[PDB]
Design an enzyme around this catalytic site. Structure first.
Site, mmCIF file in Angstrom:
data_model
loop_
_atom_site.group_PDB
_atom_site.id
_atom_site.type_symbol
_atom_site.label_atom_id
_atom_site.label_comp_id
_atom_site.label_asym_id
_atom_site.label_seq_id
_atom_site.Cartn_x
_atom_site.Cartn_y
_atom_site.Cartn_z
ATOM 1 N N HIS A 267 0.744 -1.082 0.026
ATOM 2 C CA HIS A 267 -0.081 0.126 -0.040
ATOM 3 C C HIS A 267 0.753 1.196 -0.083
ATOM 4 C CE1 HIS A 267 0.564 -0.666 4.475
ATOM 5 N NE2 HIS A 267 0.705 0.584 4.398
ATOM 6 N N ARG B 13 -1.345 10.987 4.561
ATOM 7 C CA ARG B 13 -2.346 11.511 5.761
ATOM 8 C C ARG B 13 -3.331 12.400 5.294
ATOM 9 N NH1 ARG B 13 3.392 11.848 6.622
ATOM 10 N NH2 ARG B 13 4.121 10.472 8.393
ATOM 11 N N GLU C 237 -3.603 3.677 2.269
ATOM 12 C CA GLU C 237 -3.926 3.641 3.766
ATOM 13 C C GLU C 237 -4.204 5.184 3.873
ATOM 14 O OE1 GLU C 237 -0.453 2.471 5.859
ATOM 15 O OE2 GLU C 237 -1.366 2.565 7.983
ATOM 16 N N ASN D 268 -4.560 12.151 11.830
ATOM 17 C CA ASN D 268 -4.004 12.590 13.269
ATOM 18 C C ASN D 268 -4.939 13.326 13.751
ATOM 19 O OD1 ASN D 268 -1.327 11.133 13.447
ATOM 20 N ND2 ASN D 268 -1.063 12.153 11.841
ATOM 21 N N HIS E 78 2.110 11.374 -7.421
ATOM 22 C CA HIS E 78 0.717 10.939 -7.378
ATOM 23 C C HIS E 78 0.346 9.340 -7.369
ATOM 24 C CE1 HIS E 78 1.985 10.817 -11.558
ATOM 25 N NE2 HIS E 78 1.551 9.758 -11.454
ATOM 26 N N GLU F 263 -4.077 10.147 -10.996
ATOM 27 C CA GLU F 263 -3.937 9.985 -12.275
ATOM 28 C C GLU F 263 -5.063 8.816 -12.845
ATOM 29 O OE1 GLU F 263 -0.400 8.209 -13.549
ATOM 30 O OE2 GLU F 263 -0.491 8.930 -15.761
#
Ligand SMILES: [Co+2]
Ligand SMILES: [Co+2]
Lengths: 128, 128
Positions: B5, B9, B56, B60, B74, B122
């Site tokens: 993966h 964030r 993922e 936070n 990207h 993309e």
């Protein structure tokens, strides 16, 4: 639909190629160059683009440094032996930021390393 | 070995989940919470983690913005209908930075968009 690749800008094309292939065990899938936009690409992965998600290494001519920022996290790769991987990485242009070991309250072995450009990579291990 | 993966964030977990699933057609694979370190995770993808690469998403607690930097490029995804995705994107919290259309010097339809956090995506309208 599926995830095709993740593109990362690198400061040195061959340096990154070497790391991903020689160190991480990926294969160079394909390359290209574009004079109009002045960049060269290298696609690396553990399988062909039609079968897996790979990494798109982008080298902008004459650009050897970028700002990593705080947004981008990392790319996680499976490994047969995290400790061995860590050693190989640290000795071949990389950096180990989190020694190999289980995750708190877990048994799964993981590590965090950095590539030649500072990109974070998470290694996830898959009766000695 | 395989690419598992790519971790990004985000400033708002749910917002992100809604986007990847509802707009891009991904599915919520699993979510987790880490009270100790004050963060939440969500895994989104087109198939099971055991078989393919996924995304993922990291949230936070109390952090709604990050510095994107200039390094990260990207994530490329195969799309069923590029033009349509762009439409869907444009009216569901997103920007289309490159309208759906054949690739320069090619025939393959591609487009570029931004997720709710400004990440670049993309879209590519692509053994057996
Ligand atoms: Co991860
Ligand atoms: Co790309």
């Amino acid at each position: 639909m599926r995830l095709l690749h993740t593109m990362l800008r690198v400061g040195d094309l061959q340096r990154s190629i070497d790391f991903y292939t020689k160190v991480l065990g990926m294969k160079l899938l394909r390359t290209s160059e574009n004079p109009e936009y002045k960049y060269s690409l290298a696609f690396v992965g553990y399988g062909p683009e039609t079968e897996e998600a790979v990494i798109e290494l982008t080298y902008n001519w004459g650009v050897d440094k970028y700002e990593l920022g705080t947004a981008y996290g990392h790319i996680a790769l499976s490994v047969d032996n995290a400790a061995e991987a860590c050693e190989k990485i640290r000795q071949n242009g990389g950096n180990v930021t989190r020694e190999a070991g289980p995750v708190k309250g877990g048994t799964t072995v993981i590590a965090f390393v950095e590539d030649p450009d500072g990109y974070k990579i998470e290694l996830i291990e898959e009766g000695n």
